Ligand binder design. Structure first.
Ligand SMILES: CCCCCCCCCCCCCC(=O)OC[C@H](COP(=O)([O-])O)OC(=O)CCCCCCCCCCCCC
Ligand SMILES: Nc1ncnc2c1ncn2[C@@H]1O[C@H](COP(=O)(O)O)[C@@H](O)[C@H]1O
Ligand SMILES: [Mg+2]
Ligand code: NI
Length: 1314
């Protein structure tokens, strides 16, 4: 053993101190997430020794521990505060392991693993040393200090002092290792009132600062931050580094000033937000008396820049330097204090106020060590007589924020930096991107110093004219091919084989039907260029009609008969068709001034006889979409589309496609034609079957389909039926976003799955993704002769990792919007930015260009996904809901409320649901900012005629503004409430009020938790309180826990006066009736109330009052062993007080007085009427709810009709339904209440004390209708010493807020305290 001669001894505390406010925040984070290593400071060395080193290391270590008290510090959390304890002695935590067998690559990983082991800041030491034997006289030494204990400036002082001790440097400055606790103490004897001019500065600085930054993430953000992260080391070139130095001097700014400005500009371009908040450390060592002190002095300041893209870099950089200069005036105010004052919404998913940092450190005086402290390895050594030090870089302090930029170092003319990134949010490829973008910003800054921020472009020199070569589609001549010729060829070749299946039509028969329809049309006025309305049912004539209309030279305009007549009529108005091809039934359905042809009258004609006359025209169809927008599509688009689709689907003679989509939706083009291009079979699915889950499942298992295309809706319908899947099926899902849940479900049921995307204006689909893993969904890669561009609002190309608007170019563009040329000219453009792109369609889709060539969809621009600044990943919320058992489908929308405020609304459908528990579920899987403010259940989500979700149709939500007040309903909620009220100084806390929203803040939480694990006697944590911030939610957690029984004593108020007032429970056993009283009593008096054991442990309620009283007096005396006692109670509690007084005086104790609030004297006359079990249960139900001002009337006669077990269930169900029992109350819990009621009843019936003269304040409820005498009987027990006051109220309401104030004040006037 390497510590054989150090020896372990028993440490004792020398002195207690405060923690500085600079330590409080880091301490709290460590206590909030115990496995956090993000504040493990590491400095490590390659150490070669000589024989002469000897035992000097232990000798020196022991000397250093003696010299600097700070190293023997612990930070335990105690009563009403966190403490800094200096121990006389600490056993050093030195770990020595054999690494002689470990390759150098692995050794680094190992040291990084080892140093991340988390500290408990309450068990010393808060530092440790890791040694590795690498070879003989060859070691790696890693020193690890928790940042709560000291800062890097301190590390420097130690490094230099300890180096001198080992004889590595000649000189060392004096180090002070005791000043910090003094500094801590003098600090926490000071206020920082909310009037402090610096505190006001930060509130103003940060008031309008966003909740969370809008950089797009790679992953979905965890509900609770786990501080996992990684680091990327990079260097800025000598050219660009020198440039920066000079540019800074060519302005009036710090180098740091410059680079920070660079950083903001980067985040501006990355997130496209103009409000940005970056956090920077400050040394916090202005007082020179501190410049040699070991300690944690570093404060964080949150700089909040407003970016004006119109600013020149020069103007803007200076604007930063200035604000930075102002902010440094107010660095004295701790970040924890700023967070307290600003009071942002607490959210366990992010750091408050700021999630991006920039550290700039150079640290002078460390001249010999400068290269030994870089993030990169250097040949630099320190040679001493006994040993040599060498560079050993290890990744350290990862996970603090979302992103932290760490800079200040320089090496061989190059600025050295470390990009730190949270690995739960960002991929490594994204980090590299960020570094590359950062590099680009600094270059373009020294290049073009006078340029306007907006005109500055970070994005890669896309020399090819494309952002990635993926986003450009394979070049062919598909758009030149003849579609008609292919189908004609198949008609010759395939012969009498099947073609359509509705009454099966052969290819030969199909040719006849095309001829016959085309000829019929020709005969009745139709020519090339005309437009034919097409109003048909899903028969075998449908595809024949399309091809017939085409062969006649005409274009068809879909008029689906299932669409609303006024919708059909609007299209017909706009499209102005020459005729409408329809069937016999439908001829005079529409009231339109447009001729109609019964397609059933078209004959069959031999194709041979009319082939010369058959040609396609230029236009294929006019398809309408969301005034009416008819998109005109030409045949070269369509043939380009179909051929490009065959490339993927590999359509063959044995292909068999179930066509289900309306021909009034362009994607039907694929389903109706592409088998006919290759000899396969189109199955025209009848509308009824496509809209009926089981009926569709049936037609699938039967007719042996191997290709199916549909929108998500149909797939969901299919899965919601008992569909066994089809492992040969090729599936296409398009038209709407494929969420990860459907994807993982589809994948397990289908052979091949395609996500397929495209607007109508670029011909069915433009791109397609072969989906293989649900966690990776995107818009795929382009079809042939198609190009995809992601542009900003300036129609410039975006940098990778940035969101923009998708634009599409290629052979797929529409001809135009039908007779809407202004619109066409606005939507179909060439762009100066893309001069080789040609004509482009502008989708109005929000698409993120990934660091990958991947396009991920984020849905439109007309749809608001912004709230309070930051933006919402609506799909991530939806994904969670769907995973909840019961929920079948969910849609989350952003909606506006009253004063231009936006809130999340979640719509759900499902078999059986409990809206109540939904919010609690989401709370523990999403960030706070992504939790919906409203849950609306629907039977079915509204669809479009296309079978997509019709978001515009979802009902507008109605928000509950304030949270409804609800009084605590059980002993746990009762204590929790009192505890909240007291700590927050809030007069009255409801069980749905949230700790932090009531004014709570992080240091208070620690107090609260400390108060609780005394009051409950178990280990509660600040994480629990963080995640469960309401009495209700927290009550649940505590309650579920079988290892925690409360005390029968509740402190309602700790006052200053010596003497407590003790209150005793009424018949029910609870102390709720005293809560409101306690709020109006003079707060200088301590109040304690006792509840029955019976409410906590089973069969524990006492049944004789005399025994009850003894038990309670013992409980009392543990807190108040002597003095004269002050007792009282409402109702039965008064009688308990009477008997307690009797026993107290038999013990020689004095009783100052008894408060009785409408107590009926314990005399025979006042005993209740005899009740059967039903009546007792009826009474209990009444008395249970009365304290809450609620009337719960359960007639004994109703109860007698039921069996006993049915009775208790009935009362329980009824009590819960008016909210006077917690929602999770088992029958077990209910028997606890009822049994206590029964016990106290029996006690009442057997208690009849002899007369006795105690000083009694009898407060009579002067409005109670039941008669018990002027004195409620007390004149028979107490003659001379009874003071009676009659006050407004009845026996119950006397204790209600309106009436109980006068009760409280009667007491305070009668039993005064200074
Ligand atoms: C957090 C502050 C604490 C300050 C403590 C002062 C430095 C004390 C370093 C103590 C390391 C103890 C390791 C040890 O006892 O092993 C002796 C080892 C040979 O062991 P063995 O194989 O004979 O059993 O032989 C060796 O491995 C010797 C290695 C010596 C390394 C000296 C490092 C000098 C640089 C100081 C930098 C301080 C930075 C904060
Ligand atoms: N696979 C897909 N993923 C996401 N959005 C899609 C997909 N396919 C189509 N869309 C959207 O659906 C729109 C159709 O236009 P509209 O009929 O006006 O809703 C397109 O412009 C796209 O925004
Ligand atoms: Mg569309
Ligand atoms: Ni050892």
């Amino acid at each position: 053993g390497h510590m054989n001669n150090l020896a372990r001894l028993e440490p004792e505390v020398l002195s207690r101190h405060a923690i500085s406010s600079e330590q409080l925040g880091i301490w709290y984070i460590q206590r909030l997430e115990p496995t956090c290593s993000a504040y493990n400071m590491v400095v490590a060395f390659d150490v070669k020794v000589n024989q002469s080193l000897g035992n000097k290391p232990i000798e020196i270590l022991e000397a250093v521990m003696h010299d600097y008290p700070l190293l023997r510090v612990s930070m335990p959390a105690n009563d009403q505060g966190i403490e800094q304890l200096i121990w006389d002695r600490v056993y050093p935590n030195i770990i020595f392991s054999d690494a002689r067998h470990i390759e150098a690559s692995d050794l680094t990983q190992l040291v990084e693993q080892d140093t991340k082991q988390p500290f408990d800041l309450t068990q010393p030491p808060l530092w440790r040393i890791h040694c590795y034997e690498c070879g003989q006289n060859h070691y790696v030494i890693a020193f690890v200090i928790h940042h709560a204990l000291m800062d890097f400036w301190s590390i420097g002082l130690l490094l230099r002092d300890v180096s001198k001790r080992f004889g590595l440097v000649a000189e060392s400055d004096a180090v002070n290792g005791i000043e910090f606790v003094q500094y801590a103490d003098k600090q926490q004897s000071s206020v920082i009132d909310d009037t402090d001019e610096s505190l006001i500065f930060w509130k103003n600085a940060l008031k309008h600062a966003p909740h969370v930054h809008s950089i797009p993430l790679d992953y979905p953000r965890p509900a609770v931050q786990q501080h996992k992260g990684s680091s990327l080391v990079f260097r800025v070139s000598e050219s660009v580094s020198s440039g920066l130095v000079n540019l800074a001097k060519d302005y009036e700014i710090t180098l740091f000033g410059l680079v920070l400005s660079g950083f903001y500009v980067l985040l501006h371009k990355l997130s496209n937000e103009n409000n940005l908040v970056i956090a920077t450390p400050v040394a916090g060592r202005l007082e020179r008396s501190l410049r040699n002190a070991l300690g944690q002095f570093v404060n964080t300041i949150a700089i909040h820049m407003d970016i004006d893209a119109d600013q020149t870099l020069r103007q803007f950089t200076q604007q930063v330097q200035e604000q930075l200069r102002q902010s440094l005036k107010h660095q004295k105010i701790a970040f924890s204090r700023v967070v307290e004052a600003v009071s942002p919404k607490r959210d366990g998913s992010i750091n408050p106020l700021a999630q991006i940092g920039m550290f700039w450190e150079r640290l002078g005086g460390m001249d010999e060590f400068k290269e030994l402290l870089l993030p990169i390895q250097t040949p630099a050594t320190l040679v001493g007589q006994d040993l040599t030090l060498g560079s050993f870089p290890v990744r350290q302090q990862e996970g603090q924020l979302d992103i932290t930029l760490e800079m200040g170092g320089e090496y061989q003319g190059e600025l050295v930096g470390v990009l730190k990134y949270n690995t739960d949010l960002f991929s490594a490829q994204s980090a590299e991107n960020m570094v590359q973008l950062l590099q680009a910003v600094l270059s373009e800054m020294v290049a073009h110093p006078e340029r306007k921020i907006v005109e500055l472009d970070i994005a890669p020199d896309y020399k090819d004219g494309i952002q990635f070569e993926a986003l450009r589609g394979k070049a062919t001549d598909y758009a030149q091919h003849d579609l008609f010729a292919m189908i004609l060829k198949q008609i010759d070749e395939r012969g009498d084989n099947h073609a359509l299946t509705s009454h099966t039509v052969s290819y030969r028969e199909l040719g006849q039907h095309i001829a016959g329809i085309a000829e019929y049309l020709r005969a009745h006025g139709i020519t090339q260029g005309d437009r034919v309305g097409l109003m048909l049912d899903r028969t075998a004539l449908l595809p024949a009609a399309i091809l017939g209309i085409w062969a006649a030279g005409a274009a068809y305009v879909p008029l689906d008969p299932n669409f609303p007549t006024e919708r059909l009529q609007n299209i017909i108005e706009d499209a102005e068709p020459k005729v409408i091809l329809t069937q016999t039934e439908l001829m005079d359905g529409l009231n339109v001034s447009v001729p109609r042809l019964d397609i059933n009258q078209a004959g069959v004609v031999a194709l041979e006889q009319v082939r010369e006359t058959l040609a396609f025209g230029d236009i294929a169809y006019v398809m309408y979409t969301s005034k009416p927008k008819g998109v005109r599509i030409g045949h070269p688009s369509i043939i380009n589309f179909l051929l490009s689709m065959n490339d993927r689907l590999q359509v063959t003679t044995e292909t068999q496609l179930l066509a289900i989509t309306t021909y009034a939706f362009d994607i039907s083009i694929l389903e109706l034609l592409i088998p006919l291009m290759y000899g396969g079979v189109v199955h025209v699915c009848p509308r009824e079957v496509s809209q009926d889950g089981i009926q569709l499942v049936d037609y699938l298992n039967a007719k042996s389909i191997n290709v199916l295309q549909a929108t998500p809706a149909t797939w969901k319908m299919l899965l919601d039926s008992e569909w066994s899947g089809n492992a040969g099926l090729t599936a296409l899902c398009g038209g709407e976003a494929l969420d990860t849940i459907l994807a993982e479900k589809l994948l397990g049921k289908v052979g091949c799955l395609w996500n397929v995307y495209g607007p109508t204006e670029t011909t069915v689909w433009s791109s397609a993704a072969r989906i293989t893993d649900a966690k990776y969904i995107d818009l795929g890669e382009p079809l042939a002769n198609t190009q995809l561009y992601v542009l900003d609002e300036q129609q410039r190309l975006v940098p990778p990792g940035v969101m923009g608007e998708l634009w599409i170019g290629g052979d797929g563009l529409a001809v135009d919007y039908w007779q809407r040329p202004e619109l066409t000219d606005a939507q179909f453009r060439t762009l100066p930015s893309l001069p080789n792109a040609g004509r482009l369609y502008r989708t109005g889709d929000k698409v993120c260009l990934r660091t990958d060539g991947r396009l991920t969809h984020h849905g439109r621009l007309d749809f608001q996904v912004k709230i309070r600044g930051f933006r919402i990943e609506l799909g991530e919320i939806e994904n969670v809901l769907k995973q909840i058992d019961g929920i079948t489908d969910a849609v989350v929308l952003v909606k506006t409320t009253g004063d231009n405020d936006q809130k999340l609304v979640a719509y759900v459908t499902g078999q059986e649901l409990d809206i109540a528990g939904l919010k609690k579920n989401l709370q523990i899987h999403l960030p706070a900012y992504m939790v919906p403010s409203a849950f609306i259940r629907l039977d079915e989500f509204p669809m479009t005629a296309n079978k997509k979700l019709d978001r515009k149709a979802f009902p507008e939500p109605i928000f509950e503004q304030s949270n409804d007040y609800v009084a605590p309903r059980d002993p746990i909620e009762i204590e929790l409430c009192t505890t909240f009220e007291q700590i927050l100084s809030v007069k009255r806390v409801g069980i749905h009020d949230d700790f932090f929203e009531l004014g709570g803040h992080s240091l208070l939480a620690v107090k609260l938790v400390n108060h609780l694990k005394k009051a409950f006697g178990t280990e509660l944590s600040v994480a629990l309180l963080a995640q469960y911030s309401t009495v209700e939610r927290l009550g649940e957690i505590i309650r579920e826990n079988k290892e925690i029984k409360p005390s029968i004593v509740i402190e309602l108020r700790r006052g200053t006066y010596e003497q407590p007032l003790w209150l005793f429970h009424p018949i029910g056993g609870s102390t709720f009736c005293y809560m409101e009283l306690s709020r109006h009593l003079n707060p200088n008096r301590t109040l304690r109330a006792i509840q029955s054991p019976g409410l906590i442990e089973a069969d524990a309620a006492e049944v004789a009052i005399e025994e009850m009283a003894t038990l309670y007096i013992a409980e009392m005396q543990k807190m108040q062993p002597q003095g004269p006692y002050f007792l009282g109670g409402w109702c039965f509690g008064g009688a308990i007080a009477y008997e307690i007084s009797r026993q107290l005086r038999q013990m020689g104790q004095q009783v100052t007085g008894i408060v009785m609030i409408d107590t009926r004297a314990p005399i025979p006359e006042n005993v209740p009427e005899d009740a059967d079990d039903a009546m007792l249960l009826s009474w209990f139900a009444r008395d249970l709810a009365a304290p809450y001002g609620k009337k719960l009337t359960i007639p004994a006669q109703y109860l007698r009709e039921l069996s006993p077990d049915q009775m208790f269930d009935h009362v329980l169900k009824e009590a819960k339904a008016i909210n006077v029992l917690p929602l999770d109350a088992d029958p077990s819990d209910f028997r606890l209440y009822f049994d206590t009621y029964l016990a106290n009843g029996i006690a009442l019936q057997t208690y009849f004390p002899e007369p006795e003269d105690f000083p009694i304040l009898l407060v009579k409820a002067k409005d109670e209708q039941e008669d018990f005498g002027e004195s409620l009987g007390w004149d028979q027990l107490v003659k001379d010493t009874l003071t009676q006051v009659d006050l407004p109220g009845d026996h119950s309401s006397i204790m209600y807020a309106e009436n109980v104030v006068a009760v409280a004040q009667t007491i305070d006037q009668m039993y005064p305290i200074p």
